[PDB]
């Protein structure tokens, strides 16, 4: 292994003295979705923390009423029949522990008492002035997880959200807004803005519907406003992130700036604090919460040896920088056409670009790739007219070449609400154009080593263009292919509308054998059956037959229906399958001084693992990911190790990458190809996304 690393996870336990709970079975059947509603109402009506088992509802206390009549939201009346009392013997799942634990936090108010005092004892400046018009909302969440071991773990994490004590309806009277993380007043969701329109435009019966389909005092009272008042209906704008009125939306802001919550050291000790109070508030009730953080079980070993088209491997030529200089690419597209876009402030002259270009073209010639230039496009600018001046070179003559190289200048700005920077801009615009791109910052050409950069690019470029410089010598375990898929669905009410699905198939050596990006407009909600289908269809049309081992990488979380479709077809094509979800959001965080923690892991219960897939060569707090084996006959250790190995296939060995080549830039593309009646039906064998 290496040197100790910590996780914001704390063993939690509930061994009360008074083990008596009152259970209540229903009269009819468990509407399940409503169950976790029915439990909440039981809490309120009963005033006792409660948790649900199958049908039974256990109340942390004595309740006398041989029947309870809780009234759900639908107004629906559910009757719970109080069965005898029970002697509590530990929770069964994490859900129980969590349900019951979150109640106490409420009946106790301890969390709010904290946010209360945090505000006072610190509002000393959680608010800033500035000349433009800033808060500091302290979001705090509690999760409960199990662990390979067997005990429960309280996942405590705190993050700060920054938004102006201003709203959107006010700003759309002063700028863009476009892609702006926003937040509805009485709602818990952060969306992005799309296109703001005038509210009058929607007649009147529009405001009727949604005004009833509201489940937020905010949304509701906000809709009613506009509905019973033609007066305002005109002067106010309706924003479409789902959609609400700009009068109940506050922009969530990202990182003049003299208010930073700083490094982890404190962060951990901050949660350490919050943990203490919690304890003090729930000790008298039988709750035991360990003061010691949880630590990585150990480091994982993965096959990390790559080789070129001649066999030269890194097991031998160990110096990666040297390797790249001697690698013999698995070239396939022998001649490349490329456009060169150049952004530069003032009427200057850049020999630096010319130097590099010549060195690149030549350095690639030495590898056997003639990089024939097609078009040069010089741009002068000093602001963000670049966006306004590049919005052309890009969506213009740039019509399929093999790559586009961009030399960017960086300007001192900051859009107070929207995220804008030529890097992200250029990149995203070329992603839609589905063209492989290499952004080279002029700041880098001026101060770095033209040689360490020449390499640094070459590797990126080669890959992006189907001339991968190397591939894995082998990966742990016998797998015939690694499939990575991401299905993203536009849901404007009801059950779906249309969707998009991106699939990438790599072989056993990590080579991208084929990708398939496609959208599915639909009638019935039978889009999964088809979507997943096309993947197997492509696996046979590729050369994989009965007996094949396929490891699949579901981007977000796997849905019951998708799992069945996989198992379903897998049966038809006779393929062996292992299913995996790879959660990249809201996971516990590692706290260490190791630096080389890549492979550091923590095993969770249901075959899940918390995996560090990258060396933290960036500040302090490391954000791992979660890997859960949904189905399959391979140890998670292997599946994890395979993921680590496949980290290498993003061909970026100087800038650490978190996700495996299989799901890297999926949500992004998938989330990105959801625009207009854009009908896409493309497959290729080039990792243009890199």
> Taking the domains of the chain in order of start, what are their residue ranges?
1-162+256-299, 164-251, 300-473, 476-689
Q: What are phi and psi of 274, to 5 degrees?
A: -45, -40
Q: What are phi and psi of 663, to 5 degrees?
A: -130, 10
Catalytic residue among 96, 157, 386, 486: 486
Breaks (C-N over 2.5 A) in the chain follow: 133, 174, 241, 255
CB 63 within 8 A of CB 23: no
Sheet holding 590-592, edge to edge: 294-295, 5-7, 590-592
The Cα diameter of the chain in Å comes to 87
CB 507 within 8 A of CB 528: no
* Residue environment code for 505-521, b if the CB has 16+ CB neighbours within 10 A, otherwise e: bbbbbbebbbbbbbbbe
What residues have CB less than 8 Å from 20, skipping those under 6 apart? 61, 62, 85, 86, 87, 88
Question: Residue 555 annotated as binding?
Answer: yes
> What letter does residue 558 receive in the DSSP assignment?
P
Question: Residue 486 annotated as binding?
Answer: yes
For residue 547, what are the CA distances in angstroms to 509, 571, 577?
18, 11, 10
Radius of gyration of the chain (CA): 28
Region for residue 67 given its phi and psi (left: phi exceeds 0; alpha: psi -120 to 50; beta: otherwise):
left
Tokens representing residue 306 in the block:
């790559």
- How far apart, in whole angstroms, are the C-alpha atoms of residue 135 and residue 112? 18
Catalytic residue among 103, 555, 578, 594: 555
In Å, how far from its chain's centre is CA 637? Answer: 23
Tokens representing residue 12 in the block:
């939690």
Query: What is the resolution in angstroms?
Result: 3.2
Q: What are phi and psi of 666, to 5 degrees?
A: -95, -65
**CATH, domain range 164-251:** 2.30.340.10
Quick one: which H or E segment has residue 126?
A: none
- How far apart, in whole angstroms, are the C-alpha atoms of residue 236 and residue 249? 13
Catalytic residue among 55, 212, 448, 525: 525
- How far apart, in whole angstroms, are the C-alpha atoms of residue 219 and residue 215? 7
CB 137 within 8 A of CB 161: yes
Sheet holding 152-161, edge to edge: 137-145, 152-161, 9-14, 287-289
Question: Residue 561 annotated as binding?
Answer: no
**CATH, domain range 476-689:** 3.30.420.10
Q: Is the peptide bond before 438 cis (omega within 30 degrees of 0)?
A: no
DSSP bridge partners of 87: 20
Catalytic residue among 529, 637, 667, 683: 667
Asked if 112 is an active-site residue, the reply is no
For residue 507, what are the CA distances in angstroms to 122, 473, 479, 644, 687?
55, 12, 8, 15, 14
- 3-class SS shares of the chain: helix, strand, coil, % to 5: 30, 25, 45
Q: What angle do CA 403, 407, 412 make, to 5 degrees?
A: 140
Q: Is the dihedral of CA 667, 669, 670, 675 positive or negative?
A: positive
Neighbours of 168 (CB within 10 A): 26
Neighbours of 191 (CB within 10 A): 19
Asked if 55 is an active-site residue, the reply is no
For residue 103, what are the CA distances in angstroms to 16, 46, 68, 488?
15, 12, 19, 34
What residues have CB less than 8 Å from 259, skipping those under 6 apart? 125, 126, 128, 134, 136
For residue 274, what are the CA distances in angstroms to 151, 271, 633, 648?
21, 5, 41, 39
CATH class of 300-473: alpha beta
Neighbours of 585 (CB within 10 A): 10
Quick one: which H or E segment has residue 101?
A: helix 94-108
CB 688 within 8 A of CB 668: no
Q: What are phi and psi of 24, to 5 degrees?
A: -135, 110
DSSP bridge partners of 208: none
DSSP bridge partners of 58: 23, 51
- How far apart, in whole angstroms, are the C-alpha atoms of residue 93 and residue 145? 9
């Amino acid at each position: 292994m290496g040197k100790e690393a910590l996780l914001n996870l704390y063993r939690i336990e509930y061994r009360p003295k008074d083990t008596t709970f009152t259970v209540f079975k229903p009269t009819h059947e468990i509407q399940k979705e409503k169950l976790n509603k029915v439990r909440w109402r039981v809490f309120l009506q009963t005033g006792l923390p409660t948790f649900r088992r199958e049908d039974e509802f256990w109340c942390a206390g004595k309740v006398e009423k041989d029947t309870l009549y809780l009234t759900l939201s639908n107004g629906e009346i559910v009757e719970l029949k109080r069965v005898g009392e029970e002697e509590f013997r530990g929770f069964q799942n994490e859900r129980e522990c969590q349900e019951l634990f979150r109640d106490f936090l409420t009946k106790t108010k301890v969390k709010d008492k904290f946010i209360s005092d945090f505000y006072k004892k610190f509002r000393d400046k959680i608010t800033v002035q500035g000349k433009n018009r800033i808060a500091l909302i302290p979001e705090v969440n509690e999760k409960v997880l199990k662990s390979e071991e067997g005990y429960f773990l309280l996942h405590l994490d705190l993050k700060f959200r920054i938004q102006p004590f201003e709203t959107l309806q006010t700003l759309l009277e002063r700028f863009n807004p476009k892609r702006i993380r926003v937040k509805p007043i009485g709602i818990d969701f952060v969306g992005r803005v799309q296109d703001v329109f005038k509210a009058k435009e929607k007649g009147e019966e529009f405001f009727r519907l949604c005004m009833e389909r509201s489940t937020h005092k905010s949304s509701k009272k906000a809709w009613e406003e506009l509905l019973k008042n033609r007066e305002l209906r005109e002067k106010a704008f309706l924003v479409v992130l789902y959609t609400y009125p700009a009068t109940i939306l506050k922009p969530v802001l990202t990182y003049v700036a003299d208010i930073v919550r700083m490094e982890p050291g404190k962060r951990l000790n901050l949660i350490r604090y919050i943990l203490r109070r919690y304890v003090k508030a729930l000790r008298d009730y039988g709750w035991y919460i360990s003061p010691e953080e949880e630590r990585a079980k150990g480091k994982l070993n993965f096959k990390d040896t790559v080789l070129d088209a001649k066999g030269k491997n890194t097991k031998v030529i160990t110096n990666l920088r040297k390797f790249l200089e001697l690698c013999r690419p698995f070239v396939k597209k022998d001649v490349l056409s490329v456009e060169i876009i150049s952004v530069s402030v003032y009427k200057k002259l850049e020999w630096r670009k010319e130097e590099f270009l010549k060195e690149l073209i030549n350095f690639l010639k030495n590898k056997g790739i003639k990089l024939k230039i097609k078009g040069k496009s010089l741009i002068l600018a000093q602001t963000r007219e670049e966006a306004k001046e590049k919005l052309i070179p890009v969506i213009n003559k740039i019509k399929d070449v093999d790559l586009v190289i961009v030399f960017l200048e960086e300007y001192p700005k900051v859009d107070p609400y929207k995220s804008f920077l030529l890097y992200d801009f250029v990149k995203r615009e070329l992603l839609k154009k589905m063209i492989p791109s290499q952004v080279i910052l002029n700041r880098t050409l001026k101060n770095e080593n033209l040689k360490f950069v020449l390499l640094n690019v070459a590797e990126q470029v080669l890959a992006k263009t189907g001339n991968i410089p190397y591939k894995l010598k082998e990966i742990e375990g016998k797998v015939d292919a690694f499939v990575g898929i991401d299905i993203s669905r536009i849901t404007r009410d009801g059950k779906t509308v249309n969707a998009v699905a991106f699939t990438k198939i790599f072989n056993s050596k990590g080579e991208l054998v084929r990708y398939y990006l496609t959208s599915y407009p639909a009638f019935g909600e039978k889009l999964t059956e088809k979507a997943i289908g096309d993947v197997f269809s492509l696996l046979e049309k590729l050369g994989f037959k009965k007996g094949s081992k396929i490891v699949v990488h579901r981007d977000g979380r796997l849905y019951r229906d998708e799992v069945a479709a996989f198992k379903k077809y897998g049966e038809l094509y006779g393929y062996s399958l292992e299913l995996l979800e790879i959660i990249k959001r809201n996971n516990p965080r590692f706290f260490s001084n190791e630096k080389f923690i890549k492979g550091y892991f923590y095993k969770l219960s249901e075959d899940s693992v918390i995996l560090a897939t990258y060396n933290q060569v960036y500040e302090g707090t490391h954000q791992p990911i979660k890997v859960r084996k949904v189905y399959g006959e391979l140890p998670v250790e292997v599946l994890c190790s395979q993921i680590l190995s496949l980290t290498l296939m993003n061909y970026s060995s100087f800038q650490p990458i978190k996700l495996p080549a299989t799901v890297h830039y999926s949500d992004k593309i998938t989330k990105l190809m959801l625009r207009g009646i854009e009908p896409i039906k493309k497959e290729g064998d080039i990792m243009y996304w890199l």
